[PDB]
């Protein structure tokens, strides 16, 4: 009676006067272990556990 689920979460980069917006991992001295799991683009890897 353990169940298994698939759920979705998302984000955006708005049209600025140049055009892009930032996406990275820099949140210094706020919860460092909750950062250790990321791409160059600030995104988790397919296959990694997260909680």
């Amino acid at each position: 009676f353990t169940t298994i689920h698939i759920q979705e979460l998302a984000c955006v980069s708005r049209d600025t006067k140049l055009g892009p917006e930032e996406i990275t991992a820099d949140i210094p001295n706020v919860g460092e272990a909750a950062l250790s799991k990321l791409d160059e683009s600030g995104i988790v890897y397919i296959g990694a556990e997260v909680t």
Binding site: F1, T2, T3, I4
Partner: protein, 52 residues
């Protein structure tokens, strides 16, 4: 052997149910336990057949 007020619940608890890691079949049953496995293609079935 059931009142409508609990037959109503039976017609919904089987619907609120969810996929589980080690699933197992209704042993008691009506026969619909093989129709409802095919009435949305959730089991693949031999639309022509032959040898695998």
């Amino acid at each position: 052997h059931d009142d409508a007020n609990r037959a109503l619940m039976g017609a919904n608890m089987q619907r609120q149910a969810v996929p589980t890691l080690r699933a197992d079949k209704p042993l008691v049953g009506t026969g619909m336990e093989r129709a409802v496995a095919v009435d949305s293609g959730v089991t693949a079935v031999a639309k022509r057949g032959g040898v695998v």
